[model samples]
Target: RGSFVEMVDNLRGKSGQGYYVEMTVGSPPQTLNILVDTGSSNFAVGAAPHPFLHRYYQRQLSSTYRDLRKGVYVPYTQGKWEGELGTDLVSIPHGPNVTVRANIAAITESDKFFINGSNWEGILGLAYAEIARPDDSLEPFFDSLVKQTHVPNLFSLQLCGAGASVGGSMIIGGIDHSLYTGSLWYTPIRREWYYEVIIVRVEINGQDLKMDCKEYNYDKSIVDSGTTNLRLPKKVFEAAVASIKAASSTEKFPDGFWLGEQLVCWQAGTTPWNIFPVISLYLMGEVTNQSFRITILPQQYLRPVEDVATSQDDCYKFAISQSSTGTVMGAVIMEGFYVVFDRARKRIGFAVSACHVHDEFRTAAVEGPFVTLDMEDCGYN
Candidate 1:
């Protein structure tokens, strides 16, 4: 079976923005930098010319490029874009020497004033077809591979740290035993669109917050590599904040030092992780009797973001943020785990990842043995 693999590039994750991957789009392949967004379902690129810097996709160049003449509007977690839809050839290098007919494509006419600093040419939606807009929606590249049986529908990702200093790999069509250690635990996908699951319990410092969806209309949480931090509902977040305050005993802020209600952070010379308690979450699948959990140590979650701390000691609780809606597990929590999106089996797998840096760049083990290990027996609390 043939599968496509792309090196996951974590560009500018620390400076906000999100993770990205490099791919060649259109025939005769035009090199493009795209955001790796599982939260989205459609692939889109530039709509119009930039003011004076950087290059966008030019349809006229590719002999194989086809303009379906359809238009699409996609709103992301941070920004929005609307543009024309079309088709072209998209290819993933450093793995199988293969190309996709890339039926779904877009060229945004406008964005929420797209930013030049993002260092991204467009976005590739690695998600379910159900989440895509009905009009001229192309099959998700991975889904197409799965349907054709050309490659295993399953793929795994190991994202590097926030600085993009160390890149990660997406073992498309299969798994890499080397990327992770120990047995891999599975969580059943609640829906087809996002890699979603129900929270069995949200435990902070050994306290279970009992985050049941029935209390909020069965809202499911997503694991989006595109986002920078973990976002939880306001109440759950407040409870966590109280727990942190209880766990940590110094440098308490005044009533109004926090600028926004959605985000609270630490100042210079302060380390919240040193004082905060450990957080753990157990995920439930359709089989509620079954469970899988992961622990978040202080080191992994207390990431530094702008405004949270001054330049000298710029580390705050980069791992989590407060949101008004449901919850989202983003890149901060994912960097430490090896994640597998098993579309073929209708499940998600996660285990501890080494997150090692390659001497230079990385190449996929295209011919590695197909492996799947069960770790449900080794449960974590």
Candidate 2:
């Protein structure tokens, strides 16, 4: 049987950034759209009334709601939230059939976490409990679901918002073979907290950045679905920008353009994909010192300006940004591939996504099973 155990399909959200799924929480069945994140470990939902939220889960209305008498506060790079820790019955209509007792955060106060025009009222963190708010003893939502339901300890994500409709799929407990193409390339997880992987090199148009392997994993490198851009370390970003500028026919881009402060507007029917170089990353493969490469074309690295469009032109921005932290393969990179969080085996799998068929301008590329020349550890030192 080539089929997976269970699949949660038809996830919907922002065009190329966040993807969310609806889940029934509490008894009497109140549903909320929960944003899926692989970077943190906390299942939080808006419990208080706010201008940003259309509606919130009314715990008082549910027959089965238990408060732990504890307050939980979680802080992110850009946002923060405070909530009361509680437990409730959670069932996913598109997920497995069983209902589980899931630990949830009823967020009462937040800032910049929930924004107007956003579709999700909650966040379903899929990472390990090591980074869970308050402490590691708090089991994440996915961990609770897997533990209580007795499903396979694996899940796969397909973010289909690159150029297609504003939706994606997340198959729990298995992989949907139909969602991806070719063999799945596996990379060992250097750390469990963030789906951390050892990145060996960065290449632009087949040219290596000629950097020390450790530079790619300075603080820590991770695959994060919550982040919208492909974030690179300061030095790495400079090198990439230099490479792009040298490879591109356009001599100058606005200073703010690279910093995400300004946008580039081109004629409605035109794009910069043809002149941009293909960016690739070499990840340390399953075997020690072995590696495989994942490539993202310009289409995946250039994000369209969603809210504003001029009369005769459309605007775009660089999808890759400079990060004070280590490299992050965010939505910009994951949108082009079907990513599997094979937690049971402590590895991640990637393959060309089936969703890419929607965009014929450029497609995902994977190459190599090459041996790495650097024998040093590429993870955080």
Candidate 3:
């Protein structure tokens, strides 16, 4: 809905085909396929032939690589390898049209974290954080544009599953209006990079649930682009399960119980069984007037069976096998809203919009004529 400028010249590389953004030592740049991701803050390419390193395979080395020996080191929660902060000449074909110098990272070890054939040589972390080792953290790559151009750099990721558009383009520097419509809603960030808020209460079918956001730490609430679904803690998850069970229908499948579509229907049935509990998130201020409906899908039933096998004793009871814990607000909640991640202001805002059934609504706005295809005169490398 906000103003956007279409960037036709900045799009580059072959569609659906991955290529090395830079050459490596162990393998030629043309031999490896690379994927671009913004879910995290570090960037790593697969390497080969590091005998002492506990890697899944081998590290792919490039001759054009910059030495990161004196770079900062960053650690991940579960990954075996760590990241070192350094700068590199990154090239994006049609989009940015330049071999821009950036603070990039390389993976030293990767046994515990490797995606075999997703065409991803390594990951690029987009989260805000300090550069380890050195007493300096470069401003996020996007911030560099704002300083030189006086306009916030924007990028949009279109993630399509099976029967979808595969993976879409990452429009950088500016937004393409053809991709979105309606007015943009803006909110102030409550913390550093993660969007934190004071949630007051939850409601369902006009009934208030006795859950308080203040009781639990509000700092734990975060919006992560890398995750797919909402991950709540055990206490919150149990409360939600109870509420859904109350409002759900009795048609129980071996997997789990099926809840009707309407909020009232599901609550009416599950309330008596103490199964369904109202799950809503209340924000601060007048904006606190808004609330989100939480769903209890089939995955919520697969908790661990204690007193069974030797390895199964430490598992959870009634736990959802496929679900990730820790609250994650996924694309489900992202619908009907134009979300803005303002790094300068340290805030995340969402404004109501027409439902995006697919990419139909947003794509229609940008289906016009191509503006430019010139790449010969551009110079960023």
Candidate 4:
């Protein structure tokens, strides 16, 4: 199958906006930066000028643009946008040479979704159509492209870098053998809506907290690249925080520190990784009664704050936060691994990312194929 790779640029580190790829939209081919998101299925772009955006899609300028006149409103964890559904010739200049007539959301209005300093003009959702905004009738952009092109029905992402550096790359239509090391362990997709998966346990320093497997997945669990932090259910968050504190056995933090409402600092040249414990998640494997582990180092979860001026030491805030809707493995955990969204087999694969190298430190780890006790469906009822 034919496949193409797009170099992904990230607004990570201090901004932590997300990762995006450059794409040419419409007949006249306007270059637009599109966020590569797996959590939602809305191919949306800025249709009108806004205060926060650097540029937007000009419908009047594109000769091939077709307005469907349908209205769509999509809401995410922090922001929301309303737009008009339409069709356009969307092409990834760096990707496969096929241009497809794909569904597009010409976003005209938004809430907290678009922020200043973000480099992206829109979001290209790499997910199932079930989560598409407006309705399930709206096909995801990738789906439409696959229908018109000769490519594999899967994609892979390797999000590397930290603190303002360039992110890695995204391979559309197939896996790039050179982007990851070792074999990829597969985990069944519990649902089609959000790349949902099951988590059997949470481990700190390789020791399981031993909470009920169901507690790890309250309503559902998903691997979302759009989210910046590794969000957990309140019950699991507290347990993880307590375990991290216990394992560190170091200085105490302030009241709002654990909640991510307060920032913590250390002396200059201090490496916090020495004091924090490694966190891990064991996902149910594709094979029955088996599981695999994805581990993230302290560097991944303890995000550094670059904006705060400090003369003496470096400042950071906790990246793992509370999520009432269950666990979300965001950039914190994803940055260290090469993730495969193998929709054809209905399973996601994880391997050590080729970009795992970061100034002599590896930010992520993948292990297992460990046997596990049998359990029922982990998805919501």
Candidate 5:
């Protein structure tokens, strides 16, 4: 189970970066512009000589430098980086001020993950120890913090998004009730923070869609914050795409639809059929009762008035990339869902509420995917 806290002990610095988190290594304090990411594990930072330097990086290091000679090397599909890990003080500001000494890493290879233009130094993964494996990585971050802070050794995320002004939050210690109301739904954890459950059914707009969970690896559906979108494997992706295609009129986009920064849109027609493919996830006897709200752009919205009937393939391209391993349920789908990570009980939960519409005023439902593996392999792709 994951824990959620109202206020972490830390301070808000200038620039007012809401997501900035603090860390101390070797006695001094260091701050990094971070996204409390569940998409991936491992907390890393942008180092010197990058194309775009993070504000926190500039404040910490007076001179630009690189020291890959002594750093650990990790490879990723997007890219790879070399960094050195050590002990450091980490803090998150809220109430009670969370301050703890924990392991930290400095990224020496910026090109590995393409941080050059993103303005983000790196990521601080909050997923369970099972996800950060092969290196026994991130265990110390949780172990030391829970031991030193005397806080609950759990964390929860309430990801909310409506529009530009309504981006949600990632709560660390416990949940913030002011944002939600209802009992949390939970499942048992199987040694890993993520548990396995047979995906009994999936409904689109209350309509049952044909599916075979065995065709895809259940372990692939990990509950990750480090990743930005729901990544599904080829077979699952094809299934989902086919379902969506079956329900709506489709067009192609050569360049793809731009949902947001790092997010893309897929165009489908507006019809009752469009709503029938709503998605749902079932675990044990519990089922996530809500459907994912998807924003499907009409053909007209894909192009200018004059180009509405043009033959450009750009209009038909959806935001999906063929190279991704699986469907990544990103922030777009996380909006309006109350997610509970019950580390103590080894289960997770979600609740549906009012969902915000995207800029195009399009709405769709998002569903949760159940655990398909043990905790140790939870984070593995």
Candidate 6:
């Protein structure tokens, strides 16, 4: 916690770069691009080497490294990962002597994990320790950060959405007012493992459709940054699309094709977000004893395909996908607003993201640093 901002960078991916931070591991400090993940927790770097940079953990090199009893294996919805685990020095960039010795996983084989030759090469689990076994290796990555003076047991994420601006950031221990607008709404955490909450109401085009459209088993939803689009259970998914009955078609996607971004086909100007009513979600906020509302703005839900000329008023579609388990509030829904995670209070918060705020971040990209540890001043070393 030498600085309030820590290491912040825009997430780098194909269609758009996603959020990722630079961290050093191993003895000599192998600089790796670690994905800031809140969804799943298996921090290993067996991700297939990206075309631009392919670097993973080297076991024999670090004298401080200690091999785990056996290799770790995990099967995910998209693919799988099999790799050895070990302990090493995990250091934050620009933070001197603030390194934490922790368990690090570097995958040897993976499916959807490393398929995308994206910017980040490793996964940094920031969610509850129970989500992934806590390494017994040093105070744990995040724990060590908060143990320091600057960390406030809080963090914020601003994903670079569809506006062609990849100027997103992850602020640890503090909030950047420049990224959000209006009042920040707060909601209590229903589940500890992930940022899970209760979705009591779903509104479409100004219509309030409560539980009438959904079946409840888990009765909880997780806010996941590792995921791109909003995912819902089958019954809920059908109900959501039913709200868009006008855009409905007999068209079907490939098996397990509910990836959110390309849920259905669209016809450019003929089928834009303006034509449809706004889709809103009300997550029960136990803290305020009120409902925290957030709308899926069209700009965040409507995606453009590069294959089609931007001039064609090309076909577009809703980015919400379907999940086998409960619903998930992915980055698509979260990106429309400024999302804050208050670990100390065991709750989450959201605020309407202003276009000007994004512009402020973009403007910083041209000149000053992309982060402002504090708007009032900046004197930290």
Task: Report the lDDT tens digits of candidate 6 across residue range 1-381.
Answer: 323443344344544435566778877878887777878655667534444446766676677787776676777777777777777777767333366667676677776666444666778777766667433332335765677555578888777665333446677766777766677777777656777766656667657655442342244578888777777777777767766554333444443333343334556445444454457776655433345567765556555455454444454545676667777787777777778888888888887765312221121110111121221111111
- Prediction 4 TM-score vs. true: 0.94
Q: Write the per-residue lDDT of candidate 3 for residues 1-381, one digit (tens) a residue.
A: 233334432212231222112222232223333344333444455454344322321323434446556544444565556555455545443445444445555555555455433334554444454432233365555544445454454454332221112333344554444444643434334545434433344444335556555432223455454443445555555666555545654544222422221111122113222332323443332133432222222222222222335352233233221223345544323332334555655555443322233331122111111122221111111
Q: All candidates' TM-scores?
A: 0.80, 0.95, 0.59, 0.94, 0.68, 0.78
lDDT, candidate 5, at 196: 32
lDDT of 3: 0.39
lDDT of each: 0.62, 0.84, 0.39, 0.82, 0.45, 0.61
lDDT of 2: 0.84
In terms of lDDT, the poorest run of 10 residues in model 1 is 363-372
Compare the candidates by TM-score and give the number of the best one: 2
Worst 10-residue lDDT window, candidate 2: 1-10
Tens digits of per-residue lDDT, candidate 4, 1-381, equal 423434342222224777888888897899888888898888899989898888999989889999897898777767889999899899887666689999999999999988687778899888888888787989999899889898678888888746454566777787877788888999989889899998987899878888877888898889998888999999889888899888887777886988899889877667657678888888898777888988888877887676676544688889999999888888888888999999889999999887764435545678887888754555456
Off by over 4 Å in 3: 1-39, 49-65, 71-75, 83-85, 130-139, 144-170, 195-208, 215-217, 253-326, 335-338, 351-381
Error of 5 at 179 (Å): 1.8
Runs in model 5 lying further than 4 Å from the true structure: 1-28, 56-70, 112-119, 131-134, 137-140, 162-166, 190-198, 216-219, 250-277, 284-327, 353-381
In model 5, what is the error at residue 243, expressed in angstroms? 1.8
What would the TM-score be for candidate 1 when compared with the true structure? 0.80
What TM value does model 6 have? 0.78
lDDT against true structure, model 4: 0.82
Report the lDDT tens digits of candidate 1 across residue range 183-205.
Answer: 67777776788777655566777
lDDT of 3 at 25: 21
Better of 4 and 5 by TM-score: 4
Off by more than 4 A, model 4: 1-15, 310-312, 357-363
